[PDB]
Design a protein around this ligand. Structure first.
Ligand SMILES: COc1ccc2c3c1O[C@H]1C[C@@H](O)C=C[C@@]31CCN(C)C2
Ligand SMILES: COc1ccc2c3c1O[C@H]1C[C@@H](O)C=C[C@@]31CCN(C)C2
Ligand SMILES: *[C@@H]1O[C@H](CO)[C@@H](O)[C@H](O)[C@H]1NC(C)=O
Ligand SMILES: *[C@@H]1O[C@H](CO)[C@@H](O)[C@H](O)[C@H]1NC(C)=O
Ligand SMILES: *[C@@H]1O[C@H](CO)[C@@H](O)[C@H](O)[C@H]1NC(C)=O
Ligand SMILES: *[C@@H]1O[C@H](CO)[C@@H](O)[C@H](O)[C@H]1NC(C)=O
Lengths: 522, 522
């Protein structure tokens, strides 16, 4: 049987699913770790103990515990990111889509979902892996990992809540793939890990961390990189927030044991309800000196990281999503013209760690002084501030550092605004919306994309799959390599390829070189 | 006799001169102070003691002792600024052009030459006042003042070398106009002081100084304002440089009297020969508490200054002249493309007072990062850096502070490049070159200007004279008033008058608000 597979942990029974009038093999909700419940919560995961019998793998597993977005109840644009399954701390499962018939030893791609390290699910409609596995003949895998406090509460020194366990969770699913993907037709020596946003930061963290390097071949980073300002914190800040979570829940704060034991008796929603109350994203990776030996910046300067090929990029409007959720004067229904009063508080809010001088620098850098009370210019400038600071420049800093040592870099700028996008037009090319093209949703007619969006999705997948199989997106019209001298990249849209150079250099020299120097002195 | 005039200090005999096939009276070399020689060097001017007989006022007087430029020996573009008469410490004289026949009580304009407070003469071909006195029916006066150590050596406390004596010479000449101009056909109640560069900074200093305010009605400032970074120093810096001048000349430094007496024994050229050796322009006005009661900034915020009408502005390329003379990579016979190494060192030199953070700031603010090695963009950026930091932005700050309390502001941007310029094209519309137009040299045919330049000149002159007589450059195509709201100004060129707003706001916010704050905090 094509559906019954035997693995080092037990037998598994997948199901047959239809894909664009053909079919493929799917193994859903396969366990890769021991449920991190009870005294396990907050701890490094442990491998799933082998089972007897046949594991039913014809359905999606639970989604990890996480804050659930209710800003726009029932709206499909927000709702598509929320758990579409029941939440549970018993959530460490992976999904595999295998082409039918089973390939001898084909290319594997492991998907790592985003959600700011506080949310996310492997089971979203946008991460349905059948179209990619099917269309490109790849074995497609989506893992899961604990988010929020459950995955990142960090009490450095403690072994009961060491920090970075959602990351170790990711590493264990990768190890599982390394150990078992072969029984599915996948080639363990050819695995590409790829993710978007918090997941893209994840990929880059596994490129860094010595203990993950050998568990994959190549990496793809979408709108996220390891060095993002919101992707990690110091052991100090991690400890401080862990204690503050305790304080908020009436926990004896005498010792880490005291604290941790209190947190372990609390029901899930109880941690989730107070999660936001500890900020100066609450629980994120910690630069511990273990998963990450030294500072991210020093590892990058020394070349202390996996040297391989990478494919990465950003979307045109990385910041509009967050402006709509956290800044004054933005609305899902209005054009969102921003007055100068709002613009100003909007920058105070986008560079949370900056002083007055720093704020003046940002302000002056994104204000047209001939037309300072223009609402569109202020809206769009705040969008760029958020996107440049949080996603784009940190990524360009990483792309430049890595290329000095890597074995091949491919950079992209995705600027296509889907024709069926349910979000307001002023939001442009939104953070997260290149994903539906990566996963081939445009190939399904009921979804109503245009003929060119299908064409766009098809070359995006073929670039991705080809890159996964060979280290180069092109089969022997060319996407050029990104070199520290030339710095080329392509646009990704329906129109014909255009090669450009130095993606957002001006603004990124400001964020990467200049602003940090300014905050240092002051 | 029309040429024989009797004044409060003695009879004076002028001469009839030709002007565009006609004639007018000229009274050249009239003494307004006692020769500041011997024990008088560095002291405040003393009024000229009355004489008997008739003073011969038919020729130009001596030029004050100053550094002479011979970077381009024989070259007309640099020599037109050098002394065209013998140099002597006996140089406190003034010149008057009176329309023929003699007006009953017409508008008076007093020219104050520039030259960075270390040079300048009233007798230059470009300041010939006959064309303007003639064409606009005004009585035109050019005064003189001591420059270099002779006029600005400051040892505050001392009364032998109090500093600011060159400003007081200007004030003595203004006082003399007040008391005598009526006998020449001039209206002492309708005098406009006007000058360029250091002379424009001078006019502004007389607007601030309580003791000069009543000696004129209105003011015109061309390419300079009181608050320019190179236009004044503190008493400490003044003293520091005074002592350092003595040191280079082996002087007793035990006390000011010892020093001054030594400084008074050295011949003129000896002081000049070591004038530059004291810079961390050497001797300029001092914020002494007397000529200027408080800081220039505090006087401008409190409105502690003469309230009247002002007409002022800048040229398109204020900085090319100083780049030709002091920066690496510039030449008069080359297109002067600037390497990246030279651009760097060039900003270091342009903003002498800034730390490394300030320098990075300036560099970033003026570098196109997608074409940083373009030689021409580097030349032009350095040009704008010098021009914006030393002339334009200081002036815009002045303009905005003054309009808050003034009684009428008329702003201009002169961007016409003379058809007959002997300086290279890359230098554009140079510092000082709008003067030939203000003085009507485009009206003399052998000078080989075009006819739309003769026309430009005529309207500039008419605007200047009309403004001098009424406080408005337009006789009832209009030059709008500059208001703190609309911030309107006009271009001054051969094409039809265009009205713009916010002259170089973008860069000026950087120079006037952001960089000062950056530096104050670091
Ligand atoms: C910085 O990354 C994020 C922080 C918060 C959120 C998202 C993020 O990435 C977005 C797109 C996708 O990665 C998943 C979640 C996001 C969209 C859904 N919500 C509600 C919140
Ligand atoms: C900042 O002002 C100046 C500093 C130095 C010089 C000049 C300045 O203004 C220029 C134009 C005019 O005002 C007189 C002298 C200048 C041109 C001639 N030389 C050689 C030097
Ligand atoms: C696996 O569980 C699903 C959920 O109800 C069910 O549809 C399927 O038949 C099960 N497989 C078997 C035969 O156990
Ligand atoms: C990748 O590595 C091989 C040697 O291991 C090298 O020859 C090749 O040039 C590298 N490719 C790139 C694009 O750096
Ligand atoms: C005035 O001085 C000039 C120049 O020295 C001389 O030529 C002229 O004749 C003098 N006029 C009188 C009347 O002294
Ligand atoms: C100048 O001041 C007078 C008051 O003395 C006032 O009537 C006039 O409107 C003012 N003009 C301007 C342009 O400020």
């Amino acid at each position: 049987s094509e559906l019954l597979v035997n693995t080092k942990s037990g037998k598994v029974m997948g199901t047959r699913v239809p894909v664009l009038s053909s079919h493929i093999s799917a193994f859903l909700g396969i366990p890769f770790a021991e449920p991190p419940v009870g005294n396990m919560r907050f701890r490094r995961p442990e491998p799933k103990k082998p089972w007897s019998g046949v594991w039913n793998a014809s359905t999606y597993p639970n989604n990890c515990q996480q804050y659930v977005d209710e800003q726009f109840p029932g709206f499909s644009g927000s709702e598509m990111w929320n758990p579409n399954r029941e939440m549970s701390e018993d959530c460490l499962y992976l999904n595999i889509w295998v082409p039918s018939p089973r390939p001898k030893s084909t290319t594997v791609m492991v998907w790592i979902y985003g959600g700011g390290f506080y949310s996310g699910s492997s089971t979203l409609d946008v991460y349905n892996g059948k179209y990619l596995a099917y269309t490109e003949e790849v074995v497609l895998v989506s893992l899961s990992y604990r988010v929020g406090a459950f995955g990142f509460l960090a009490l450095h020194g403690s072994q009961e809540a060491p920090g970075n366990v959602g990351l170790l969770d990711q590493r264990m699913a990768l190890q599982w793939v390394h150990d078992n993907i072969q029984f599915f037709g996948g080639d363990p020596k050819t695995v590409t890990i790829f993710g978007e946003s918090a997941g893209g930061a994840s990929v880059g963290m596994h490129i860094l961390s010595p203990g993950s390097r050998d568990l994959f071949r190549r990496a793809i980073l979408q709108s996220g990189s390891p060095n993002c300002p919101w992707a990690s914190v110091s052991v100090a800040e991690g400890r401080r927030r862990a204690v503050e979570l305790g304080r908020n829940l009436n926990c004896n704060l005498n010792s880490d044991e005291e604290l941790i034991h209190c947190l372990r008796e609390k029901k899930p929603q109880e941690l989730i309800d107070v999660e936001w109350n500890v900020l100066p994203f609450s629980f994120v990776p910690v630069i511990d000196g273990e998963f990450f030996p030294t500072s991210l910046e020093s590892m990058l300067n020394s070349g202390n990281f996996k040297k391989t090929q990478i494919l990465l990029g950003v979307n045109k409007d990385e910041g509009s999503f967050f402006l709509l959720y956290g800044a004054p004067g933005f609305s899902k229904d209005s054009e969102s013209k921003i007055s100068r009063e709002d613009f100003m508080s909007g920058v105070k809010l986008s560079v949370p760690h900056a002083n007055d001088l720093g704020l003046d620098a940002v302000t002056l850098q994104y204000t047209d002084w001939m037309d300072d009370n223009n609402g569109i210019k202020n809206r769009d400038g705040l969008d760029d501030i958020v996107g440049d600071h949080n996603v784009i420049c940190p990524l360009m800093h990483f792309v430049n550092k890595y290329t000095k040592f890597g074995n091949g870099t491919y950079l992209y700028f995705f600027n296509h605004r889907a024709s069926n996008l349910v979000w307001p037009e002023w939001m442009g090319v939104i953070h997260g919306y290149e994903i539906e093209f990566v996963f081939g949703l445009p190939l399904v007619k009921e979804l109503n994309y245009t003929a060119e969006e299908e064409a766009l999705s098809r070359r995006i997948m073929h670039y991705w799959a080809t890159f996964a199989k060979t280290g180069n997106p092109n089969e022997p019209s060319k996407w050029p390599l990104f070199t520290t001298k030339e710095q080329k990249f392509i646009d990704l849209n329906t129109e014909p390829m255009k090669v450009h150079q130095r993606l957002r250099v001006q603004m990124c020299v400001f964020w990467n070189q200049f602003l940090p120097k300014l905050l240092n002195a002051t």
